[PDB]
A paper describes a structure:
To describe the conformational space of the T. brucei ATP synthase, we resolved ten distinct rotary substates, which were refined to 3.5–4.3 Å resolution. The three main states (1–3) result from three ~120° rotation steps of the rotor relatively to the static Fo. We identified five (1a–1e), four (2a–2d), and one classes of the respective main states. The rotor positions of the rotational states 1a, 2a, and 3 are related by steps of 117°, 136°, and 107°, respectively. Throughout all the identified substeps of the rotational state 1 (classes 1a to 1e) the rotor turns by ~33°, which corresponds approximately to the advancement by one subunit-c of the c10-ring. While rotating along with the rotor, the F1 headpiece lags behind, advancing by only ~13°. However, due to its large, rigid peripheral stalk, the Polytomella ATP synthase mainly displays rotational substeps, whereas the Trypanosoma F1 also displays a tilting motion of ~8° revealed by rotary states 1a and 1b. Within the four classes of the state 2 the rotor advances by 23° and F1 returns close to its position observed in class 1a, where it is found also in the only observed class of the state 3.
Mitochondrial ATP synthase consists of the soluble F1 and membrane-bound Fo subcomplexes and occurs in dimers that assemble into oligomers to induce the formation of inner-membrane folds, called cristae. Dissociation of ATP synthase dimers into monomers results in the loss of native cristae architecture and impairs mitochondrial function. Although overall dimer architecture varies among eukaryotes, we find that subunit-g together with subunit-e form an ancestral oligomerization motif, which is shared between the trypanosomal and mammalian lineages.
Numbering used by the authors:
A (entry chain r): 1 to 62
B (entry chain L): 4 to 68
C (entry chain f): 2 to 136
D (entry chain c): 29 to 57
E (entry chain n): 18 to 52
F (entry chain p): 26 to 105
G (entry chain m): 16 to 144
H (entry chain e): 341 to 383
C-alpha cells in the first residue's frame, strides 16, 4: 500500500539499512549485467556458428 | 577573487575533447572499412551465384532435353 | 472417540520448541506488525523494505531456474540439431566449441525479431552448410 | 499456444480445484 | 522503552475512518490507534 | 521526498502557532544521531550498518557478481 | 550557447555556496583570493601523502600478515568479517577472470586448427577484425 | 514481546521514537521553524 | 494422461506463513462493495447475501498473488489458460444461479419479460426475454474472456518491449562514445519512460480487472435480491 | 483439377485488420473522459464519484479492445 | 465460546465449510472435475509431438 | 476448364474483418458512459438509477460484439 | 480461353464483411441509451415510458443485426 | 495437389492496417482536449484537476495506440 | 511444393494505409480548435491558458500522426 | 523456389489511399469554420481573435494534408 | 526468377480511392452550413458577416477536394 518505512535520501544512505543494502546490491547486479553483455556479445573474437543455416527455430515452429 | 593563475580545468576539458575527436576519427574509419568489406562479400556471393548458374546451364545443355 | 474434532485436544506440550518458535515469530513480527504495514487484501504490504528485499530475491531465483533448467533445453536442442543431430556428436566437440555455439544462441535470443535475418536465412551464394548437410 | 490448449486441461485445473478445496480453508482459519 | 508492536491499525487513519468514534480522542485532537 | 515511488512520511504538526512559539528548543537533550535535524535529510548522521561498507561498495559487489555470472563459462567452460 | 553556460555556472555556484563545510569553504576562499585552483592542490597533496606513505603501507602489510598468520584474526572472527571476506573472494574471482581475458587478449578461447569452427574464422566478413 | 528485545530499533524506529517521544514538541517546533525559514528564503 | 506440476506460489506461501502466524487488521480491500450491499437503512434481505464475501476475498488474494507478482520477470501465471478460467467462472456463476433457482420461486424471473403490457408479448417481450436469458451466459463468458485477454495482451506487450530494449541497449550502447550519442540518449530516455509507463499501467489494470471480475458476480447476485422494509 | 494452396503470409493481413478495432476503443475512451471534464465543470462536488464511474467505463471499453488484440496475437503467432 | 473456525480441526472445518456454507459450489466443482477427467484427459502421440 | 482451388489462409482475413465490428461496440459503450457522467452531474440524487440503465445498455451492447467474436472463432478454428 | 475457377475460401471474407455491419448496430444502441440517461435526468418522472421507447429502438436495431448475422451464417456454411 | 506458397511483401500490408488504429487514438485525444477547454471556460477555477484528468485520459488512449504500434512494428520485422 | 514469391509493388500499398491514419489526426486538430473558439467566447479572459492547452493537445495529436508517418516512409523506401 | 515479381500498377493504389487522408483534413476544417460561426454569433466583438485562431487551426490541418499529398505524389511518380 | 508485370486496369482502382476523399469534403461543407443556420438563428443581424466566413470555409475545403480530384484525373488518364 506504500504507506511508510525507511527511505534513503540519496545513494550514500543506502548503507544505513540492511534491506536497502541488499536492494542496492541487486540494482548493481541488474545494471552491471548489461555492460557485461555488451562486452561479451560484441567481442571481436565472437564468431557465428558455421552450421547456423543447418537448422533454426523458424523452420521448427513453422 | 583574483584572476586565475592557472588554466588546469580548461586544459583538462581540451584533453577530453581531443581524445573524443580522435575516437570519432577512428570510428568513422572503421565503419567505412566495414561497409566496404560488406559490399565486397555481397559481390563475392553474387559472383558465386552467377558461376553456379552458368554451371547449371552447361549441365542442362549436356542433359539435352 | 478415536480422534477428537476439537483443536483443544493437544498432541504436544505448551513448551515444545518454544525457543525456535519465538525466534521465528520475532523474525516475522519485527517488520510486518507495524502501523505503516497496511496490506492491500493481504498481498501488497505497506513497508517499502519488504518490496526492496523480496523483488530481487524472487527475480534471482526465477532467473536461476530459467537459465539452468528451461533455456538449457533450447540451447541443447540447437547444439544437437546444428552439429550432428545426436548427443554423442555434440560431445565429440570441445568445451570451447560448445561455448561458442551457446553464445551464438544467446546472440540469436537477443536479436529476436529486431535484428539481421542472415543469422538464420542463408543468403544466395553462401558457402556454408545448408539444411541437408547431415541428411 | 498452451493457454488455448486442452491436451492436459484436467491436470492443469487440478491446481485451482486444490486451492479451492484445500488451501482456502487454511487461509480462512 | 522497548521496540514491541502495538494494537494493529491496518494502515488506516482513525480521524477519518468509518468507525472513528470508537477511537478515543486526546487533548491534541488526534484519535487513538486503539481503544 | 521520494526515492522512485517510495515517499518519506511526514509527521503532521499538532501544536498551534501560539503554543509552538512558547516551546524552548534544547538540542543538548537530543540524541547524537538526530542533531541539527533536517526533515529533508533525517538520516544524514545515521550510523552505517557495517563500518566502512559504502553504498558504492555494495553496488560494485553486485556488478562484480553479474560479471562473474556472465564470464565464468568463458574461463571454465564445461561440456554438455 | 551562452544562456545555457550562464545557467550552468549559476547552478554550480549555488551548489558550491550551499555546502556547509567549514574546511571546504575556507580553502575555496583562500584559493579564490590567491587565484589558484583548490582541486589541483588537493590532488598534489594526496599524491605527496601517498608517496610518503608507501613504506607505511609495506609495514602495515607485514603487520597484517603477522596478525593473520598468528591466528589472532580468527580468534575474534565475527559475521562482519565473514561479509568482508565474501566481498574479498568475489573481487578475487572477478579479477582472475579479467586477468585471463587480458592475458589471452580475447573474450573467448582461441579456436584450435583442428576444430570444425575454423570455417567461421575463414568466413569473416572483415578479416582485419 | 521480550523475544524482540534482541533486535533493537532500526533507523526508522529511532526516528519515530525521537519525533513522537517526550521531546516531540521541541522537534515539531524546530522543524516548523526551519521549514518556515526555508519557505521565506525561497520567496 | 496425468501431469504432475506445481504452482509458482511456494515462496509466497512461505511468506504468508511467516507474516500471518499472528493476527493483523485488514482495512483496504480491492472489492469493498461485497460487504456493503444495502445503503438505505431499514432495508434487509432474507437471502444469504453475504455468502460471497469469503469467496471474494480468497479469489482476490489468489489472483493478486499471481497477477501482480507476474510483473517480475520470469514469474509464471500457472493458471493462465482460457478453459481453466472458464471453469472457475462457471463454478462461481452457475453455483449462485443454481442457488437462486433451487429456491423454486418462479416469480423471481418475472422481470426477465422486459417491457409493459402495452408491448406486444410474442413479437417484442418474448424476444427480449430470450435475449436477456442469453445475456446472462454471455456475461459469464465475457467476464472470463476479459480476465484472460487482459493478462495475455499485457504480458505479450511487456515481453516484446523488453526484447527491443535489450537489443538496443546491448548492441547500440557504443553510440555513447560516438558522434551520434544524442540519438541513442534520446532513444534510451524514451525507452525508460515507456518502461515505467507500462509497469504502472499493468499494475493498475490488474487490480481493476480483479475489481470488475468480482463486480460481475456481485451484479448477478444483486439482480435477483429483494429487500424488505422494517416496520 | 483439384488444387490446394496454403498461403502463409495472409496471417499478417488478418492481424492488421483486428488492430483497427482499437480505433473505436481508443476513441470511445476519449469520449468518456471528454464527458467527465464537461461534467466535473457542471458539478465539481461529485468529481470523485464521477472519476470512479469513468474508470469503470474505461475498463469495459478497454476490455473489448483486448478481445481484438487477442485475435491479432493468435493469427500473428500461428 | 464455540466457533467452527477456532475450535474445530482443519478437516472438520473443511467439511462444514463445503457442506453447510458452500455446498452448491462444491457440487458444481465436482461436476466440472468429472467432466474434465471424462472429456479432457487424453493426448495422442501426434499431439504430444506437436505441443 | 473446371478448376477448383482452396486457399488455406483466407480465414485469417475473415477473422480480422469480424474483429473490426468491435470498434463500434467499444465506441457505443464510451458514448453510454459519457452520457452517464454528464447526466449524473445534472441529477445526482438519481445517480444509482442511471447506473443500472447504463449497465443494461452495456449488457445489450457487449452481446452484439460476442456474435462477431463468435464468428471469429468459427473461422479461426476452421 | 474459357477458364472456370471455384475458390473455396472466399466465403470467409464475405462473412467477415457482414459482421462489420454490427459496428453500426452496437453504436446505435449506445446512442439510444446515452440519450436515455440524459432524458431521465431531465425528466425523471417519465423514466418508464422512456425506458419502453429505448427498448423498442434497441429491438429494431437488434433486428437489423439478426439480418446481418443471417447473411453471415448463410455465406459461412453455404 | 498440395501447394505451399510464401508471399513476402504481405507484412507491409498488415503493418499499414495497424497504423489506421492510430486514427481513432489521435481523434480521441483531440476530443479530450476540446472538452477540456469547454470545461475550463465554464469553470475556470478548476484549471489543474481537469488538466490532470485530461493527461490520464491521454495516457490510456496513448496506451491503446501503443498496443497497435507494437504489432505494426512487429509485423514490419517479421 | 515450396514456392517463395516477392512482390515489389506491395511496399506502396502499406504506405498508403499508414497515411490514412493522418485523417484521424487532422480531424482531431479541428476538434480542438473547433472547441477552442467556443471556450474563448464563453470565457474571453482565459484566451491565453486555453490557447496553451490547445497547443498541447495539437502537439500530442500530431505526435500520433508522426508515429504513423514514420511507418509510411519506412515502407516507401524499403 | 525463389521468385521475384514486380507489379507495376500498384503505385496507383497507394496513391489513392493517401488521398483518403484528406477526408479527415477537409472535415476538420469544416468543424473549425462551423464552430467559428457559433462563437462569432455568441460573441461578435471577438471576431478578429477567433478568426485568427481559425486560420491557425486551418494551417495546422493543412500541414497534415500536405504530408499525405506528398506521399501520394511520391508513390504516383515513382 | 525476375518477372515484371504491368496491370492496366489498376489505375481505375486508385481513381476510386481518391474519390472517397470527397466524402470528407462534402460532409465538411454541410457541417459549416449546419452551424451557419444556428449562428444565423441565434443573432440574425450578423448574417451578412457570417455568410462571408461560411463562404471562406467552403473555399478552403473545396480546394482540398481539388487535390483529390487532381489525382483522380491524373491516374484516370495515365
Ligand atoms: C590498443 C592499445 C593502444 C595503446 C595506446 C597508447 C596508450 C598510452 C601510452 C602512453 C602514451 C604517453 C602518455 C600520454 C598520457 C596522456 C594522459 C595524461 O597524461 O593525462 C593527464 C592529464 C592531466 O595532466 P596535467 O594537465 O599535468 O594535470 C595537472 C594536475 O595534475 C591536474 O590535477 P587534477 O586535480 O585536475 O586531477 C584530475 C585530472 C587528472 O586525472 C587524470 O589523470 C585522468 C586520467 C589520466 C589518464 C587519461 C588517459 C586517456 C587516454 C584515452 C582514453 C583511455 C581511457 C581512460 C579512462 C580514464 C578513467 C578515469 O582529471 C582530468 O584529467 C579530467 C579529464 C576529464 C575531463 C572531463 C570533462 C568533460 C566535460 C564535457 C562537457 C561537454 C559539453 C558539451 C556541450 C555542447 C553544447 C552544444 O589529463 C588528461 O589528459 C585527461 C584525459 C582524459 C581523456 C578521456 C577520454 C575518454 C574517451 C572519450 C569520451 C567518451 C565517453 C563520453 C562521451 C560523452 C559525449 C561527448
Ligand atoms: C511413480 C513415481 C512416483 C509418483 C507416483 C504418483 C502416483 C499417481 C497416481 C495417479 C494419480 C492420477 C491423478 C493425478 C493428478 C495430478 C494433478 C496435479 O498434480 O495437479 C497440480 C496440483 C498442484 O497444486 P499446488 O497448487 O502446487 O499445491 C499442492 C502442493 O502439494 C502444496 O500445497 P499445500 O502447501 O497447500 O499442501 C499442504 C501442505 C502444507 O504445507 C506443508 O505441509 C509444507 C510442506 C509441503 C510439502 C508438499 C510440497 C511438495 C514439494 C515438492 C517435493 C518436495 C521434496 C520431495 C523430495 C523427493 C526426493 C525423491 O502440507 C502437505 O503437503 C502435507 C504433506 C507433508 C509431508 C511431510 C513429510 C515429513 C516427513 C518427515 C520424515 C522424518 C523421518 C525421520 C527419520 C529419522 C530416523 C533416525 O497438485 C495437486 O493439487 C496435488 C496432486 C496430487 C494428486 C494425487 C496423487 C497421488 C498421490 C501420490 C503420492 C506419491 C508418494 C510416493 C512418492 C515417493 C517418492 C518418489
Ligand atoms: C497430552 C500429550 C502430551 C505429549 C507430549 C509430547 C512432547 C514431545 C513431542 C512428541 C513427538 C512429536 C509429536 C508430533 C509433532 C508434529 C509436529 C507438530 O508439533 O505440529 C504442530 C502441532 C502440535 O500439536 P498441538 O498444537 O499441540 O495440537 C494440534 C491441534 O490439536 C490440532 O491441530 P489443527 O487441527 O489446527 O491442525 C492439524 C493439521 C490439519 O490436520 C491434518 O493435516 C490432519 C490430517 C491430514 C491427512 C493427510 C493425509 C491424507 C491422505 C488421504 C487419505 C488416505 C486414507 C487411507 C485409508 C486406508 C487405505 C488402506 O494442520 C496442518 O495441516 C498444518 C500443520 C502442518 C505441519 C507441517 C507439516 C510438514 C513439516 C515438514 C518439516 C520437514 C521438512 C523436510 C526436512 C528435510 C530435511 C533434509 O501438530 C499438528 O498440528 C499436527 C499436524 C499433523 C499433520 C499430519 C500430516 C501427515 C502427512 C504425511 C502422511 C503420510 C502417509 C503415508 C501413507 C503411506 C501409504 C503407502
Ligand atoms: C473405496 C472407495 C469407494 C468405492 C465405491 C463405493 C460405492 C460407489 C460409490 C459411488 C459411485 C458413484 C458412481 C457414479 C455416479 C454418477 C457420477 C458419474 O457419472 O460418475 C462418473 C465416474 C464413475 O464411473 P461410473 O459411472 O461408476 O461407471 C464407470 C464408467 O464405465 C466410466 O465411464 P466414463 O467415461 O465416465 O469414465 C471416465 C472416468 C471419469 O473419471 C473421472 O472423471 C474421475 C473424477 C473424480 C472425482 C472426484 C470427486 C471428489 C473430489 C474431491 C475434491 C478434490 C479437489 C481437487 C484435489 C486435487 C489434488 C488431489 O471414469 C472412471 O474411470 C471412474 C473412476 C473413478 C475413480 C474415483 C477416484 C477418486 C479419487 C479422489 C482423490 C482425492 C485426493 C485428495 C487428496 C487430499 C490430501 C490432503 O466418476 C465418478 O463417479 C467420480 C466420483 C467417484 C466417487 C467415489 C466415492 C468417493 C471417493 C472414494 C475413493 C477415495 C480415494 C481417495 C484416494 C486418496 C489418495 C491420496
Ligand atoms: C502497491 C504498488 C506496488 C508497487 C511496487 C513498486 C516497486 C518498484 C521497484 C523499483 C525497481 C526494482 C528493481 C529490482 C531489481 C532486482 C534485480 C534484477 O536484476 O531485477 C531485474 C528485473 C528485470 O529487469 P530486466 O528486464 O532489465 O532484466 C534484464 C535481464 N535479462 C537481460 C537477462 C533479460 O526487474 C524487475 O523485473 C523488477 C520489476 C518490478 C515491478 C514491480 C513489481 C510489484 C509487484 C511485486 C511486489 C512484491 C512485494 C512482496 C512483499 C511481501 C508480500 C507478503
Ligand atoms: C481443441 C478443441 C477445443 C474444444 C474446446 C471445447 C470447450 C471445452 C470447455 C471445457 C471447460 C469448461 C467446462 C464447463 C462445464 C461443462 C459441463 C458439461 O457440459 O458437462 C456435461 C457432461 C455430460 O456428461 P456425459 O458427456 O457423460 O453425458 C452422458 C450422455 N450419454 C450417455 C448419452 C453419452 O457432464 C459430465 O461429464 C458429468 C457427468 C457426471 C455428473 C452428473 C451426474 C448426474 C446426472 C443427472 C441427470 C441424469 C441422471 C438421472 C438423474 C440422477 C439420478 C441419480
Ligand atoms: C481401537 C483399538 C482396538 C484394539 C486394540 C489395539 C491396541 C494396539 C496397541 C496400541 C499401543 C500404543 C497406544 C498408544 C496410545 C494411543 C492413544 C490414542 O489412541 O490416541 C489417539 C491419538 C490422537 O489423539 P487426539 O485425536 O488428539 O485425541 C485423543 C483423545 N480423545 O492418535 C495418535 O496420536 C496416534 C497413536 C497411534 C498408536 C497406535 C495405535 C495402533 C492401533 C492398531 C489397531 C489394530 C489392531 C492391532 C492389534 C495388535 C495386536 C498385537
Ligand atoms: C582492455 C580494455 C581497454 C579499455 C579502453 C576502451 C577505450 C574505447 C574507446 C572507444 C570506444 C567507442 C568505440 C566505438 C566503436 C565500437 C564498435 C564495437 O562494438 O566494437 C567492438 C567493441 O565493443 C565492445 O566490446 C565494447 C562495447 C561497449 C562496452 C561498454 C563499456 C562499459 C560501459 C558502462 C556503462 C554503464 C553506464 C554509464 C553511463 C555513462 C554515459 C551516460 C569490437 O567488435 P568489432 O570488431 O567492432 O565487431 C564485432 C562484430 N563481431
Amino acid at each position: 500500500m506504500l504507506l511508510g518505512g525507511f527511505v534513503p535520501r540519496r545513494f550514500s544512505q543506502f548503507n544505513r539499512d540492511p534491506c536497502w543494502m541488499f536492494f542496492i546490491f541487486s540494482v548493481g547486479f541488474w545494471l552491471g549485467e548489461y555492460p557485461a553483455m555488451m562486452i561479451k556479445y560484441n567481442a571481436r573474437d565472437l564468431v557465428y556458428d558455421p552450421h547456423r543455416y543447418v537448422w533454426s527455430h523458424h523452420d521448427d515452429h513453422h | 577573487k583574483a584572476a586565475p593563475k592557472t588554466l588546469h580545468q580548461v586544459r583538462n576539458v581540451a584533453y577530453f575533447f581531443a581524445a573524443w575527436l580522435g575516437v570519432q576519427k577512428g570510428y568513422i574509419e572503421k565503419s567505412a572499412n566495414d561497409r566496404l568489406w560488406v559490399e565486397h562479400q555481397r559481390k563475392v556471393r553474387q559472383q558465386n551465384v552467377e558461376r553456379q548458374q552458368a554451371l547449371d546451364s552447361i549441365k542442362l545443355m549436356q542433359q539435352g532435353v | 472417540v478415536l480422534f477428537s474434532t476439537y483443536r483443544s485436544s493437544r498432541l504436544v506440550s505448551k513448551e515444545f520448541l518454544h525457543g525456535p518458535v519465538m525466534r521465528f515469530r520475532a523474525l516475522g513480527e519485527y517488520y510486518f506488525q507495524r502501523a505503516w504495514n497496511g496490506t492491500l487484501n493481504w498481498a501488497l504490504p505497506g513497508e517499502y523494505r519488504l518490496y526492496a528485499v523480496m523483488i530481487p530475491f524472487i527475480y534471482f531465483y526465477h532467473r536461476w531456474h530459467n537459465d539452468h533448467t528451461l533455456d538449457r533445453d533450447h540451447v541443447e536442442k540447437a547444439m544437437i540439431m546444428r552439429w550432428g543431430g545426436t548427443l554423442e556428436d555434440v560431445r565429440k566437440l570441445s568445451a570451447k566449441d560448445q561455448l561458442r555455439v551457446r553464445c551464438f544462441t544467446d546472440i540469436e535470443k537477443l536479436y529476436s525479431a529486431y535484428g539481421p535475418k542472415d543469422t538464420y536465412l542463408q543468403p544466395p551464394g553462401d558457402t556454408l552448410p545448408g539444411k541437408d548437410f547431415y541428411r | 499456444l498452451e493457454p488455448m490448449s486442452t491436451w492436459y486441461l484436467a491436470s492443469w485445473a487440478m491446481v485451482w480445484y486444490y486451492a479451492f478445496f484445500f488451501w482456502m480453508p487454511m487461509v480462512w482459519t | 522503552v522497548g521496540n514491541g508492536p502495538t494494537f494493529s491499525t491496518g494502515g488506516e487513519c482513525m480521524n477519518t475512518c468509518d468507525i472513528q468514534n470508537a477511537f478515543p480522542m486526546n487533548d491534541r485532537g488526534v484519535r487513538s490507534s486503539s481503544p | 521526498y521520494n526515492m522512485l515511488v517510495f515517499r518519506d512520511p511526514k509527521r503532521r504538526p499538532q501544536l498551534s502557532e501560539e503554543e509552538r512559539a512558547k516551546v524552548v528548543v534544547n538540542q543538548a537533550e537530543w540524541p547524537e544521531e538526530f542533531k541539527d535535524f533536517d526533515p529533508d535529510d533525517p538520516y544524514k548522521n545515521s550510523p552505517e550498518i557495517i563500518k566502512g561498507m559504502s553504498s558504492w561498495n555494495l553496488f560494485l559487489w553486485g556488478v562484480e557478481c553479474a560479471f562473474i555470472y556472465q564470464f565464468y563459462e568463458l574461463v571454465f567452460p564445461k561440456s554438455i | 550557447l551562452c544562456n545555457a553556460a550562464s545557467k550552468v555556472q549559476a547552478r554550480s555556484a549555488k551548489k558550491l555556496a550551499a555546502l556547509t563545510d567549514a574546511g571546504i569553504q575556507k580553502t575555496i576562499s583562500e584559493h579564490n583570493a590567491n587565484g589558484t585552483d583548490a582541486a589541483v592542490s588537493s590532488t598534489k597533496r594526496y599524491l605527496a601523502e601517498q608517496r610518503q606513505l608507501f613504506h607505511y603501507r609495506v609495514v602495515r602489510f607485514f603487520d597484517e600478515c603477522h596478525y593473520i598468520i598468528s591466528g589472532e584474526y580468527f580468534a575474534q572472527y565475527t559475521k562482519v568479517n565473514l561479509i568482508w571476506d565474501l566481498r574479498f573472494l568475489t573481487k578475487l574471482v572477478v579479477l582472475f577472470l579479467i586477468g585471463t581475458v587480458l592475458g589471452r587478449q580475447s573474450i573467448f578461447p582461441p579456436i584450435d586448427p583442428d576444430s570444425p569452427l575454423v570455417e567461421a574464422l575463414v568466413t569473416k566478413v572483415n578479416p582485419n577484425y | 514481546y521480550d523475544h524482540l528485545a534482541s533486535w533493537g530499533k532500526d533507523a526508522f524506529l529511532r526516528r519515530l521514537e525521537f519525533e513522537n517521544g517526550p521531546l516531540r514538541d521541541q522537534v515539531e517546533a524546530h522543524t516548523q521553524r526551519l521549514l518556515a525559514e526555508r519557505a521565506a528564503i525561497a520567496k | 494422461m496425468f501431469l504432475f506440476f506445481f504452482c509458482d506460489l511456494f515462496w509466497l506461501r512461505l511468506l504468508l506463513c511467516m507474516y500471518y502466524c499472528v493476527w493483523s487488521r485488514l482495512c483496504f480491500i480491492v472489492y469493498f462493495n461485497c460487504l456493503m450491499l444495502i445503503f438505505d437503512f431499514l432495508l434487509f434481505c432474507l437471502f444469504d447475501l453475504y455468502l460471497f464475501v469469503g469467496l471474494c476475498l480468497f479469489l482476490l488474494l489468489w489472483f493478486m498473488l499471481f497477477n501482480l507478482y507476474s510483473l517480475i520477470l520470469y514469474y509464471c501465471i500457472t493458471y493462465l489458460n482460457l478453459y481453466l478460467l472458464f471453469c472457475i467462472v462457471f463454478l462461481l456463476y452457475i453455483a449462485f444461479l443454481f442457488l437462486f433457482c433451487f429456491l423454486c420461486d418462479f416469480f423471481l424471473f418475472n422481470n426477465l419479460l422486459v417491457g409493459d403490457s402495452f408491448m406486444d408479448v410474442f413479437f417484442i417481450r418474448f424476444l427480449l426475454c430470450f435475449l436477456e436469458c442469453f445475456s446472462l451466459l454471455c456475461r459469464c463468458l465475457s467476464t472470463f474472456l476479459r480476465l484472460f485477454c487482459n493478462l495475455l495482451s499485457s504480458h505479450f506487450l511487456l515481453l516484446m518491449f523488453f526484447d527491443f530494449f535489450y537489443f538496443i541497449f546491448v548492441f547500440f550502447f557504443y553510440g555513447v562514445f560516438c558522434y551520434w550519442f544524442i540519438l541513442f540518449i534520446f532513444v534510451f530516455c524514451f525507452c525508460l519512460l515507456f518502461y515505467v509507463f507500462l509497469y504502472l499501467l499493468d499494475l493498475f489494470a490488474a487490480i481493476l480487472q480483479l475489481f470488475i471480475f468480482c463486480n460481475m458476480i456481485l451484479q448477478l447476485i444483486m439482480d435477483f435480491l429483494l429487500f424488505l422494509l422494517f416496520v | 483439377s483439384t488444387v490446394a494452396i496454403s498461403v502463409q503470409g495472409l496471417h499478417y493481413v488478418g492481424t492488421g485488420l483486428a488492430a483497427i478495432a482499437l480505433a473505436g476503443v481508443g476513441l470511445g475512451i476519449g469520449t468518456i473522459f471528454g464527458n467527465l471534464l464537461v461534467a466535473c465543470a457542471r458539478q465539481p462536488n461529485l468529481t470523485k464519484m464521477l472519476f470512479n464511474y469513468a474508470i469503470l467505463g474505461f475498463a469495459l471499453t478497454e476490455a473489448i479492445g483486448l478481445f481484438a488484440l487477442m485475435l491479432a496475437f493468435l493469427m500473428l503467432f500461428s | 465460546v464455540y466457533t467452527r473456525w477456532k475450535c474445530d480441526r482443519l478437516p472438520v472445518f473443511q467439511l462444514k465449510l463445503f457442506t453447510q456454507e458452500y455446498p452448491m459450489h462444491a457440487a458444481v466443482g465436482i461436476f466440472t472435475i468429472i467432466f474434465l477427467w471424462k472429456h479432457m484427459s487424453h493426448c495422442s502421440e501426434e499431439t504430444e509431438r506437436k505441443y
